[PDB]
Amino acid sequence: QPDPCSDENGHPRRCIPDFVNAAFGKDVRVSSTCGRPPARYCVVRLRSCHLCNSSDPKKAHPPAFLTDLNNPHNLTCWQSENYLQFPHNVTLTLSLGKKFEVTYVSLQFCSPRPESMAIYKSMDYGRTWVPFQFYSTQCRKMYNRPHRAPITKQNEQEAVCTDSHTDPLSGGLIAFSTLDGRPSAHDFDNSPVLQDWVTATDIRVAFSRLHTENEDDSELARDSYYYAVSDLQVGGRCKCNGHAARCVRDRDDSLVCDCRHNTAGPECDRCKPFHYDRPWQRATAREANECVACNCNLHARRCRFNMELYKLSGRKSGGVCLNCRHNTAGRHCHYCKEGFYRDMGKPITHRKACKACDCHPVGAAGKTCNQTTGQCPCKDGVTGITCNRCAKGYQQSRSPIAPCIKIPV
Amino acid sequence: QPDPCSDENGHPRRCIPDFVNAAFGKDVRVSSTCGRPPARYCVVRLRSCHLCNSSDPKKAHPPAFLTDLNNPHNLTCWQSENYLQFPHNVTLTLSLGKKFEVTYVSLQFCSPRPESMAIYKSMDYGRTWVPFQFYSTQCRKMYNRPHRAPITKQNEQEAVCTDSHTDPLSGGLIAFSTLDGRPSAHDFDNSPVLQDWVTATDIRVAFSRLHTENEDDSELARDSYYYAVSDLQVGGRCKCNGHAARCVRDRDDSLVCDCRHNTAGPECDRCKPFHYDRPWQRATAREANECVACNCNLHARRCRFNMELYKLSGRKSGGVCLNCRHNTAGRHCHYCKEGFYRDMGKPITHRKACKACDCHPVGAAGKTCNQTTGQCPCKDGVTGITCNRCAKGYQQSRSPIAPCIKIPV
Ligand SMILES: *[C@@H]1O[C@H](CO[C@@H]2O[C@@H](C)[C@@H](O)[C@@H](O)[C@@H]2O)[C@@H](O[C@@H]2O[C@H](CO)[C@@H](O)[C@H](O)[C@H]2NC(C)=O)[C@H](O)[C@H]1NC(C)=O
Ligand SMILES: *[C@@H]1O[C@H](CO[C@@H]2O[C@@H](C)[C@@H](O)[C@@H](O)[C@@H]2O)[C@@H](O[C@@H]2O[C@H](CO)[C@@H](O)[C@H](O)[C@H]2NC(C)=O)[C@H](O)[C@H]1NC(C)=O
Ligand SMILES: *[C@@H]1O[C@H](CO)[C@@H](O[C@@H]2O[C@H](CO)[C@@H](O)[C@H](O)[C@H]2NC(C)=O)[C@H](O)[C@H]1NC(C)=O
Ligand SMILES: *[C@@H]1O[C@H](CO)[C@@H](O[C@@H]2O[C@H](CO)[C@@H](O)[C@H](O)[C@H]2NC(C)=O)[C@H](O)[C@H]1NC(C)=O
Ligand SMILES: *[C@@H]1O[C@H](CO)[C@@H](O)[C@H](O)[C@H]1NC(C)=O
Ligand SMILES: *[C@@H]1O[C@H](CO)[C@@H](O)[C@H](O)[C@H]1NC(C)=O
Ligand SMILES: [Sm+3]
Ligand SMILES: [Sm+3]
Ligand SMILES: [Sm+3]
Ligand SMILES: [Sm+3]
Ligand SMILES: [Sm+3]
Numbered sequence: 001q002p003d004p005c006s007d008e009n010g011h012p013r014r015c016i017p018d019f020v021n022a023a024f025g026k027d028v029r030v031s032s033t034c035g036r037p038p039a040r041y042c043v044v045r046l047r048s049c050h051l052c053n054s055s056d057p058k059k060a061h062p063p064a065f066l067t068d069l070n071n072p073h074n075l076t077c078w079q080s081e082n083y084l085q086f087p088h089n090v091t092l093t094l095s096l097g098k099k100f101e102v103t104y105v106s107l108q109f110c111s112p113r114p115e116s117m118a119i120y121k122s123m124d125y126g127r128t129w130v131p132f133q134f135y136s137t138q139c140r141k142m143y144n145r146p147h148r149a150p151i152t153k154q155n156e157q158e159a160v161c162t163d164s165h166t167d168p169l170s171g172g173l174i175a176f177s178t179l180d181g182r183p184s185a186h187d188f189d190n191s192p193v194l195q196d197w198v199t200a201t202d203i204r205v206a207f208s209r210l211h212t213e214n215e216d217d218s219e220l221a222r223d224s225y226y227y228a229v230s231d232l233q234v235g236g237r238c239k240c241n242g243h244a245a246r247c248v249r250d251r252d253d254s255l256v257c258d259c260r261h262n263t264a265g266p267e268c269d270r271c272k273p274f275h276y277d278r279p280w281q282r283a284t285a286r287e288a289n290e291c292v293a294c295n296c297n298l299h300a301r302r303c304r305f306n307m308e309l310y311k312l313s314g315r316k317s318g319g320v321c322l323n324c325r326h327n328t329a330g331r332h333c334h335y336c337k338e339g340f341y342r343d344m345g346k347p348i349t350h351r352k353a354c355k356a357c358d359c360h361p362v363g364a365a366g367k368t369c370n371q372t373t374g375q376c377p378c379k380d381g382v383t384g385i386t387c388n389r390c391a392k393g394y395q396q397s398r399s400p401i402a403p404c405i406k407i408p409v
Numbered sequence: 410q411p412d413p414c415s416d417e418n419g420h421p422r423r424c425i426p427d428f429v430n431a432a433f434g435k436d437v438r439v440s441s442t443c444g445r446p447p448a449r450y451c452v453v454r455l456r457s458c459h460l461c462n463s464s465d466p467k468k469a470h471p472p473a474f475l476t477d478l479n480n481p482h483n484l485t486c487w488q489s490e491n492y493l494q495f496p497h498n499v500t501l502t503l504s505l506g507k508k509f510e511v512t513y514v515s516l517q518f519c520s521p522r523p524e525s526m527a528i529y530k531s532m533d534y535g536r537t538w539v540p541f542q543f544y545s546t547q548c549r550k551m552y553n554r555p556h557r558a559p560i561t562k563q564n565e566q567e568a569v570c571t572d573s574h575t576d577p578l579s580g581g582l583i584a585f586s587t588l589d590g591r592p593s594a595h596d597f598d599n600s601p602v603l604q605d606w607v608t609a610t611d612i613r614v615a616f617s618r619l620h621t622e623n624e625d626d627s628e629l630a631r632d633s634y635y636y637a638v639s640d641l642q643v644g645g646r647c648k649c650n651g652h653a654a655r656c657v658r659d660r661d662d663s664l665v666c667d668c669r670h671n672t673a674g675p676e677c678d679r680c681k682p683f684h685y686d687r688p689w690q691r692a693t694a695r696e697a698n699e700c701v702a703c704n705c706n707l708h709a710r711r712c713r714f715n716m717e718l719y720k721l722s723g724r725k726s727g728g729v730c731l732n733c734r735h736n737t738a739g740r741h742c743h744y745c746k747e748g749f750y751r752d753m754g755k756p757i758t759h760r761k762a763c764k765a766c767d768c769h770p771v772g773a774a775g776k777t778c779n780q781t782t783g784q785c786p787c788k789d790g791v792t793g794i795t796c797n798r799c800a801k802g803y804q805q806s807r808s809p810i811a812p813c814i815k816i817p818v
């Protein structure tokens with residue numbers, strides 16, 4: 001069970017959390033639940049009505065039932081409140097509290113499937129919602145949607161209406177594939193819009209009309225106007241952009257990717273401090289697109305990225321250093337500032353590879369060193385890096401203006 | 410009659426003024442002169458006394474007579490006042506008002522030569538005097554001097570006493586050679602002390618006892634106790650140290666060498682402004698020892714000499730420049746100061762052969778040029794003297810930190 005982000009040889013490798021039913025176990029918020037106050041429900045010569053009493057445990061159908069274990073034997077099932085009018089839309093809302101890549105959303109009913117329902121998603125933690133899938137026989141009437149609309153390479157963030165659900169009365173499932181039907185699911189791994197389509201922080205499914213005049217017209221309701229669902233599932237992985245092997249509870253229970261590849265953020269959607277030599281790209285299966293640290297030769301704490309710099313190279317590197325501290329300067333603090341010179345004995349990384357100009361006042365003709373070698377501008381007859389000694393064939397005078405005069409012969 | 414200081418080829422040549430009788434024509438100052446009031450003088454069986462009357466022109470003997478033309482015929486002669494006691498010293502003082510190199514001092518008497526006289530000189534324009542020559546029979550008694558003292562190579566600034574004058578009564582000369590007798594007159598041209606010995610700004614000759622008991626003891630005087638001199642001469646040249654062809658009247662009649670060889674002063678005893686590359690030596694017959702101008706490549710008005718500098722070379726040059734003005738510096742203002750660089754197009758002498766560092770702010774890694782070539786410290790990929798253009802194989806970025814990034818291939 002090795003590190004999935006760490007390739008063999010300690011290298012980077014794209015990594016994504018286990019695929020899960022994110023709904024499982026989690027508490028779902030339903031607009032209507034039978035049992036409060038207790039009331040009998042007929043179950044349709046099929047009329048065998050039983051009691052839904054919320055208090056009475058063995059005869060209750062709470063929303064908890066929606067998500068717990070479902071085995072055909074001793075199966076368990078939530079049930080909406082009864083005698084629904086027509087205008088109704090009964091809603092189940094699920095809040096993951098983290099961005100997810102959802103592959104499917106599936107419900108299994110104990111009641112007959114709705115004639116109209118609609119799946120929604122929140123990308124924004126519950127403030128606004130988006131059409132995900134529509135199900136109805138009368139598409140244009142109920143949801144104002146073309147029936148079985150086509151999905152071009154454009155307009156493939158389209159939430160379609162379909163009669164697929166209409167096929168049953170004793171129960172049965174209706175499941176929604178997010179990727180199915182889209183043209184660009186060939187290579188989702190590098191699809192910018194399908195990677196956005198399959199993202200949700202909350203999920204909401206809203207039944208809006210039941211499967212019913214022959215007896216008595218179309219108006220008032222009866223014991224059998226209710227919905228029941230046994231198992232809700234949203235299948236998908238935690239949204240980590242491939243830079244994390246799992247999600248996990250942060251400080252203060254805000255579930256978040258355990259980020260890797262020198263990425264940070266809740267979705268690993270960015271690079272980690274001082275790791276800005278390369279732009280944050282989402283990890284594909286080909287290149288793990290980790291965040292490589294800029295290089296400052298140990299003379300800068302902070303760092304910055306320039307995209308031109310990246311583009312101007314072979315898309316190799318674009319990092320930049322800030323306030324080079326040890327009398328260094330340059331993009332990478334690579335060279336020694338004016339007024340100093342590269343101490344060649346120390347290595348550039350060393351705190352003190354930049355040494356100062358204690359050049360000779362009389363000897364040298366200037367104050368500033370060569371910024372590599374240290375050589376000061378020697379007066380005509382003086383030699384040395386400091387210009388602190390007369391060339392051979394010259395004699396030291398007491399004069400500051402000119403020491404080291406020519407001996408002739 | 411060409412320039413004697415200017416050798417053929419316009420070169421330097423030692424030059425000295427015409428040799429002269431400096432006393433000639435000049436007014437002499439005598440302590441005693443007969444004629445005021447008129448009195449008869451006996452001239453010694455020789456007693457043929459005539460009249461000295463200062464007013465009476467044809468019978469006067471003023472000091473003017475001492476120096477004017479002297480031809481044996483119609484000769485002319487000054488005469489001291491008469492009836493001199495013994496203590497007397499009668500003095501003739503001559504003031505040249507300029508330093509001279511005197512070869513001889515000669516007097517010709519109409520009276521009998523003194524038994525004691527003494528020649529003196531002033532080197533200091535009349536304040537103090539120095540023994541030059543002594544003449545007496547009683548040397549130790551009169552002048553307190555050894556008779557015919559010898560003249561070593563040392564102690565050859567000695568003023569000797571001699572009986573040379575004693576050999577006559579009707580007249581006759583007594584002349585004094587300054588150089589005669591000295592050992593170092595072989596090469597006076599390069600003798601430091603004989604060149605000093607023969608120097609005088611004033612000359613004074615003092616008769617102190619006459620050439621007389623057989624008749625009447627030794628006490629009171631008679632008509633014939635007087636001195637008379639016909640021609641006084643001091644022979645010599647104007648003291649120019651060989652750097653001037655003649656002396657001549659300055660502003661305000663202060664006679665002075667017309668100095669040459671880039672020398673100045675009254676005696677040409679020094680070098681002329683900004684001509685201090687070589688110490689002032691007196692011109693010998695071998696080397697004219699002119700004053701060579703120091704070199705400042707036209708960037709300094711003033712200049713100075715260092716003797717160490719001269720000694721440190723092959724006694725070649727020792728000049729130094731002051732406040733190099735055109736952003737130059739150095740002994741000769743030879744190089745360009747820091748913050749500038751030698752404009753190689755102009756010649757060093759040009760006002761503007763020092764050009765400034767308008768180096769590139771982004772391109773170059775420093776503010777200061779090479780002080781010869783101008784090259785600034787180029788950042789890694791930039792080329793140019795200003796570092797104002799990217800090297801080939803590099804692409805200009807908008808970044809100040811690093812423009813001119815590597816194109817790879
Ligand atoms: C069911 O849904 C829509 C609205 O969706 C939600 O309904 C509730 C379950 C609750 O979640 C609300 O916050 C949502 O608005 C119903 O009709 C719409 O709701 C607005 C309420 O602001 C109402 O004014 C309009 O009739 C509708 N607005 C828009 C923009 O369409 C409706 O009852 C059901 N929908 C269908 C298609 O039957
Ligand atoms: C003649 O000379 C000396 C002094 O020389 C000068 O005498 C005058 C002509 C006048 O020029 C003075 O200014 C000079 O001093 C006579 O004796 C000396 O003179 C000083 C006077 O200050 C006197 O006190 C001393 O006797 C002498 N001083 C010294 C230092 O010797 C003297 O009359 C004559 N000399 C001889 C040798 O006979
Ligand atoms: C430091 O010295 C270097 C090396 O001399 C300077 O750059 C060189 O100048 C020579 C001059 O002959 C050229 O031949 C080289 O091509 C240059 N090499 C480079 C620019 O890498 C440089 O200008 C000096 N810099 C400082 C700050 O003194
Ligand atoms: C100006 O540049 C010169 C020439 O590069 C510097 O002196 C030379 O440095 C090189 C380095 O490779 C040596 O090989 C030469 O021997 C040096 N020549 C000299 C000293 O004459 C000099 O230090 C620089 N001066 C300034 C003011 O920038
Ligand atoms: C529902 O069950 C609770 C708990 O036993 C009880 O209080 C209530 O009476 C029941 N209601 C009916 C209608 O049986
Ligand atoms: C000297 O000459 C002047 C001018 O002739 C005269 O005044 C004076 O009397 C003369 N003295 C004697 C003593 O002859
Ligand atoms: Sm590998
Ligand atoms: Sm696993
Ligand atoms: Sm269940
Ligand atoms: Sm009926
Ligand atoms: Sm010649």
Ligand SMILES: [Sm+3]
Nearest residue numbers: 413426427428
């Ligand atoms: Sm001549």
Ligand SMILES: [Sm+3]
Nearest residue numbers: 474485486639
């Ligand atoms: Sm005469």
Ligand SMILES: [Sm+3]
Nearest residue numbers: 622623624625
């Ligand atoms: Sm007698």
